[PDB]
Design a protein around this ligand. Structure first.
Ligand SMILES: NC(=O)c1ccc[n+]([C@@H]2O[C@H](COP(=O)([O-])OP(=O)(O)OC[C@H]3O[C@@H](n4cnc5c(N)ncnc54)[C@H](O)[C@@H]3O)[C@@H](O)[C@H]2O)c1
Ligand SMILES: NC(=O)c1ccc[n+]([C@@H]2O[C@H](COP(=O)([O-])OP(=O)(O)OC[C@H]3O[C@@H](n4cnc5c(N)ncnc54)[C@H](O)[C@@H]3O)[C@@H](O)[C@H]2O)c1
Ligand SMILES: NC(=O)c1ccc[n+]([C@@H]2O[C@H](COP(=O)([O-])OP(=O)(O)OC[C@H]3O[C@@H](n4cnc5c(N)ncnc54)[C@H](O)[C@@H]3O)[C@@H](O)[C@H]2O)c1
Ligand SMILES: NC(=O)c1ccc[n+]([C@@H]2O[C@H](COP(=O)([O-])OP(=O)(O)OC[C@H]3O[C@@H](n4cnc5c(N)ncnc54)[C@H](O)[C@@H]3O)[C@@H](O)[C@H]2O)c1
Ligand SMILES: Nc1ncnc2c1ncn2[C@@H]1O[C@H](CO)[C@@H](O)[C@H]1O
Ligand SMILES: [Br-]
Ligand SMILES: [K+]
Ligand SMILES: [K+]
Ligand SMILES: [K+]
Ligand SMILES: [K+]
Lengths: 460, 461, 461, 461
């Protein structure tokens, strides 16, 4: 077997050992594997996958394969691959092109090596994406391939928003499932995953004590909520910034002071609007917004000396790293850990005190400087991925008549009943015992003993 | 002189007025509406039947409605939830109010009827504000001609919304309603953080029990169960959580709680044999938060650790089978809303008996029964939604609409997210928080307006 | 059939008795001593003068001393700390008690006097139980002859112990004393976890203010300061901590608190220019825990954010400059032990004035003044130490020793660690905790006895 | 041509140097000692044998000692605790260091011997810095002639101090020691908050296991047990605590933990029947923190839930019975310092077997074995104390004292509280904290100097 490219194939045995441990940590995913392997629901599926080549993604991959699918995989971030996971997947005869520390050119090359097999476009019929990079490339560069694709399953908030923008503009060519907005994903992965992995990545990158220090978390959505708890539980004094008054209300009630980097919250683009007093005492800033330029150049210039700067949103443009590359000198401490000396661009003093520490060059810090979310959390997200892949592959959109295609070209979430069945296996994984409603109680609240237990409007 | 009221002690009015004045400083969203709309008088001509806990916070809501032009007739929607100084102060302002702490069930119904009737005849009401649905059902069952002239209902709580939705699907709902509960600045503020503040508060006032190091079982992990669990966990309790919803059960696990069931394998077999006796024999405190019926049943009560505290913070008392305890066990009142239930017999009890439970508020909502309910600054969000919902439904004038137009608008709706966000902003400003304003380029990037709304309607927060 | 007492309402005794019977189930260490030493009567012939907050918890302490054979005459050592139902139950049991909630300063000294004097002349006391040193000082400075018949003092709190040490240092202490405070089951239980339970409790009862999301400044980070900061932080307050001890400030930093000073660079020069007005203008709640004087001074009170809550949980009310506020600002009683201090003037205030502070318990012990102080299961440790200390000093019979032997026994020391561990063990058993027993090899490996003590006297826990 | 070292990879020096420069900015108490004492050179002539984990933090400690005039020869005090980039950077600085991560027990003793001997002969050492007492015991048993010229030992950890105290009790300690551990800026900073930081850190790096919602059992609740419990509880683990000290068990209860014993009724009768298999069958993670022997025994290991993680964060690896697991069960290495222990037999195993345990760091110090131990800003307090202890003992010149003077100073003591406070102050300033300065009236009121010390030696913090 040669249809792969990993950093070191001899890491396969290590990756296999961690895959075997991960299976015991992913009961909802392994429950689907045991339940569906006999009937082979993904028989005939050819899946283009673009998501962080981690140990957890390895278990997702082998689950899709155990259900009958062929895949060609790549990481959808340059720093997120676990090399031992990529090696184990390649050793199993699965086409994978990913390694930790890719260049932007090597990143595009890897996605092309999944799209292309033997120099010709692969005959793919399913897509699994994280952030929308593979989705955008197929729509703009290989639009003829989409004629044979039955659907897309998107992992993350940012990718879903891109899918919704294409649907609003009528440029989306195949239906998609919003995996992100399953509650066993958004309210599990996005929140508790970053709760687990944010302080994890900061410790591995810097070994900085967090207790007693001042943090500023930009954003208080699901990632911002989990990030803020990751820092607060370590004893940081966490301040939260937000543009959504509702999310800001939650930060207040959760015990956080809500502040803005700009005086009165108004960013007029000038340095005079920067709350220099506030930023001058922040030891750590974390961007969680999915927005652009939320930690801008003027904020970076006003930050306290030796503050840590990192992004746990999907894309690195949350921080203005381009400004830091152009104006400041970078000193690599170790991979994915850079000191940014604000003394100038041409040369730094090794003992300079006026620097910032940038993690993962602005990319997702939890995956860049650690291993991202743990297996038992990703279990929920990737069980939804398997269910979403099974659903769309069964619908066979690309083979339907155009009259039927237009009727089901949309971006849907999985039904709540499946969301609950994923949650149940997760709860059993903790040893939790859910109570069974009596018929009288189920009638009293208007639900089935079997569920679903909440209306679609319920926010949990 | 004004006599159209009934309260426990009118001489408490001065004390009530002082606390109302403090509460105004704690409710900036509510007082912001009072300042924005005072000149317009958007509720001029509104006659509001109100049934909601007669607390200091409800007083600020009442006086905001009156300040916007409305007349009201008020009662409490629980027998133990009235703050008597709040009721007295409202009555002293010439506002008809019929509420006192410690009503009998007979007096409870009388009080709601005193709002419905004025001088022995149906009041010329045209708006309804309800908490739990008791006033809504009485109008639908007993005064249907009054509902013809009523423009809408603004319902406060989850249980009342469910009753409204059941009436809607049955075609028995006569006027449209606004689901006030499902505003984020209500459900994810009041239900959760309000119970976080007030649950351990009520337990301390009632029992003065140390909570740290003791075992708690919280039945339910919805918004009330989440806040209730945090209320006990932050005090140092070892909290276990029961749930029928595996998604909520998943959140409990991730939040750091062991998820257990009072029944072996979660299955009630209709006998004591299915009770997890080892589990319940270690529980010092059980709190029901489900809005469901009989989630702390007789067989659970029998198996509870001696001297365990039993209370409910859902809307109705039937979460606990107190009827069983009235029928079978001897009650000893320690103080108002605090009873020792001796499991040794029905007739009497040894004064030093050790085999008793401590029931709070006789099973009624414990935060309002044994304390004062949610704090003003939290109720500010709920009651700002209530005022906005009263304005919107009153301006719609459903009662004046033709039959064909009424049918297009008979529904149970929530307020639009933009109003939910504007309520949250005033709450945030009350904390001194500074919301960031998006740049035009940032607003374009994430596809929203600079002024909001900032999330799609599907967003769960 | 008894008249040798003075309480607020004797008809409250039945209520107090019901709460005493509950508290007995919450105090296993104390009741454990009552069961153990019952038939032995180790306090036979003891006549104890007691000055400590007349709460339910002190009731079980008093009745334990009586059950061990002692006679007592009791007063409260704070004007606002008595639970009137507790004092009534103690009076109804035939024990002289002079205490009620809301004493004046002169009424306070009268009550201590009524325990010192029985039927016009000094009682033949031989033991002293004190909390703060007020009873101790009155005996030394106003009744020195009675100290010739007293076998010792058992002091409850940190401030009283400090006062005992200066007397020992200056050679004015006439009878030996036991530092009850510095037992670990006291200081590291009572002072810390008691205030954790009862601080937010008292603030809630007095004001019903939401704490989450607001700004608190805790002056001091000793045992009381540590528990107070947690009491507020666990409710979601943003807590800043002031300290003069860098080691305690270090703990505050590591515990997750920003360490600040009300004075610029920590230097108080008495001028308003030294006040960090930007800092104090953001504080919604200030809590003094120092045991020091004037740690929340006049300039801090002037610079505090409008409508901030000001309270004190250290033993003496002079931590806050309430004298300045009485002299310059107008006091509005919201309810007992809750006052609004209007900074707009002295001789009047607008009923709707916004520039006021809220002072709890008039600067006295806020947890005891506005709530019920520490819960029974926490006070169980402190008062089990008090009983053991009373037993030890009474058996020593200091006043009966020759002057040579007295000089060798005149000191202020703590109970042995072994007793500290035996109290702790009963508390752990009360929680259902199971302590592990060392094997013979393990005890030898770490060089301790299987029964204990398990730590050297230098261990800090 | 410096060759007097042995590290894993000298080319890691540049990376280790970069992290040392970062660490200097995180250790203001250590760097404050450098600036204050550099010109004075208080350690000129000192030749320090050092045995403590060769981390980046130790590198800053080493270079502070050298900056003050000391020469050192260094080894790590654990086979897994070295950071090879730290060891490489120290050797590149021309400092003799013999340490690498993953030594065999033979290489461990060889490394210590390489510091003791220079060019095959005893080095002219005169000071000892030790962590655990391994270097101390080797000198007392094998090189007593070197001890004659050594002025003192400065011991880092609780276990080492206990060994020193045993030698002092038995009259076998040959040089005086400073108990660095029992500084408050060590014991109550390093032992507690360091393990808080690094325990979950090590478990995450070794296993990447989610901790939220899982069951943990912490054996011991001293300072390391307190910090380990918080490390897990803050992640959302359900933490149960075991203890033989009832006072520490009391703190665990009050801190919100259930206190359990691995043995029925806490009595280990040796037999397999005394194991609480029901409890251990639910534990996902067990952490030993006792400094004792065999607190996680073979029967506990046989009863642990499948796939449970087993680790130790006490100083020595014999807290867990790893020798039993080597004799009976198959070890599968996942990766360095992570082993699956298959309970299905000693010879071989199935690659898909589910009956295994995960042992971290082969039972050695898990925080240093699987991560990097405590962060710089925490080690700053410990190592500022180490430097101060070295200066104090070196200036005393015990080895030069006559026999009569040596006898009056042969002891194991702690640094004076004033130095403890001055370390804490610099730590507090490192966080940006502002300590308040007492006014002369306040300092007189509580009886302390404005400069400190602010607490008596009995104070436990
Ligand atoms: N690294 C990970 O493991 C991980 C996991 C899930 C999602 N993500 C990514 O993280 C990002 C956030 O996802 P989410 O689920 O939290 O989305 P979300 O919609 O729940 O939260 C984003 C929040 O950012 C706020 N925000 C936007 N612009 C802002 C600004 N200028 N200043 C302050 N706040 C601002 C919004 O108000 C919103 O509340 C996305 O890009 C998503 O793909 C990363
Ligand atoms: N007292 C207060 O201050 C206050 C405040 C808000 C709401 N409420 C009341 O509290 C109740 C709950 O409100 P909510 O907003 O939390 O509703 P919710 O729907 O969000 O939560 C109810 C939860 O109970 C669970 N549940 C149902 N039956 C159960 C059973 N047998 N065992 C265990 N769990 C079970 C459901 O799965 C659900 O998650 C309602 O009656 C509401 O009116 C009271
Ligand atoms: N209300 C209660 O229930 C209760 C319980 C126990 C003790 N107390 C009282 O509380 C007080 C404190 O007791 P403790 O045991 O915590 O004492 P402590 O000695 O342990 O701590 C007091 C702290 O105050 C600090 N401090 C002193 N002056 C200061 C100043 N000007 N600014 C800032 N910090 C300052 C000291 O540095 C010290 O750390 C005593 O008076 C004690 O009697 C009250
Ligand atoms: N890894 C690190 O970074 C680090 C840091 C400091 C100390 N340590 C080591 O950790 C150990 C503990 O140190 P410490 O400062 O916490 O000491 P400590 O004396 O404060 O605590 C040890 C505790 O273990 C308890 N214990 C003893 N035997 C027990 C048993 N069989 N079951 C349950 N509990 C038992 C004791 O009662 C005591 O409270 C020492 O060996 C010390 O050298 C490690
Ligand atoms: N202090 C209070 N005043 C008025 N209503 C309250 C108070 N506390 C809780 N409630 C409301 O009571 C309802 C439960 O009956 C909840 O929906 C909640 O909004
Ligand atoms: Br049924
Ligand atoms: K991972
Ligand atoms: K209230
Ligand atoms: K009490
Ligand atoms: K480290």
């Amino acid at each position: 077997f040669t249809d792969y490219k990993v950093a070191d194939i001899t890491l396969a045995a290590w990756g296999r050992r961690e895959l075997i441990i991960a299976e015991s940590e992913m009961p909802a995913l392994m429950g689907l594997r045991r339940k569906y392997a006999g009937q082979q629901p993904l028989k005939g599926a050819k899946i283009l996958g673009c998501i962080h080549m981690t140990i957890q993604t390895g278990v997702l991959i082998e689950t899709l394969v155990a259900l009958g699918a062929e895949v060609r995989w790549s990481s959808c971030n340059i720093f997120s691959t676990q090399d031992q996971a990529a090696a184990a997947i390649a050793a199993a005869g699965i086409p994978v092109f990913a390694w930790k520390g890719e260049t932007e050119e090597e990143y595009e090359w890897c996605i092309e090596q999944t799209i292309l097999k033997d120099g010709q476009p692969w005959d793919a019929n399913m897509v699994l994406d994280d952030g929308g990079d593979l989705t955008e490339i197929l729509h703009k560069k290989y639009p003829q391939m989409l004629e044979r694709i039955h659907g897309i399953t998107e992992e993350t908030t940012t990718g879903v928003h891109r899918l919704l923008d294409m649907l609003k503009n009528g440029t989306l060519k195949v239906p998609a499932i919003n995996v992100n907005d399953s509650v066993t994903k958004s309210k599990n992965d996005n929140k508790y995953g970053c709760r687990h992995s944010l302080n994890d990545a900061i410790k591995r990158g810097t070994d900085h004590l967090l207790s007693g220090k001042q943090a500023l978390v930009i954003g208080y959505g699901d990632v911002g909520k989990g990030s803020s708890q990751s820092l607060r539980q370590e004893g940081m004094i966490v301040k939260v910034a937000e543009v959504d008054p509702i999310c800001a209300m939650q930060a207040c009630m959760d015990g956080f002071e809500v502040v803005s980097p700009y005086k009165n919250g108004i960013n007029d683009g000038t340095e005079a609007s920067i709350d220099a007093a506030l930023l001058g005492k922040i030891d750590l800033i974390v961007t969680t917004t999915g927005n652009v330029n939320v930690c801008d150049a003027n904020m970076l210039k006003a930050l306290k000396k030796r503050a840590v700067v990192c992004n746990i949103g999907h894309f690195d443009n949350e921080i203005d790293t381009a400004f830091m590359r152009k104006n400041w000198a970078w000193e690599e401490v170790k991979p994915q850990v850079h000191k940014i000396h604000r003394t100038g661009k041409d040369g730094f003093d090794a003992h300079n005190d006026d620097y910032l520490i940038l993690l993962a060059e602005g990319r997702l810090v939890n995956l860049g400087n650690a291993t991202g979310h743990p297996s038992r959390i990703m279990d929920g997200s990737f069980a939804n991925q398997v269910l979403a892949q099974i659903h769309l592959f069964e619908q066979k959109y690309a083979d339907l008549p155009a009259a039927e295609k237009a009727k089901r070209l949309s971006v849907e979430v999985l039904p709540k009943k499946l969301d609950e069945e994923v949650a149940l296996e997760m709860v059993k994984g903790f040893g939790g015992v859910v109570t069974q409603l009596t018929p009288k109680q189920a009638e009293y609240i208007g639900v089935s003993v079997e569920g679903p237990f909440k209306p679609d409007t319920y926010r949990y």
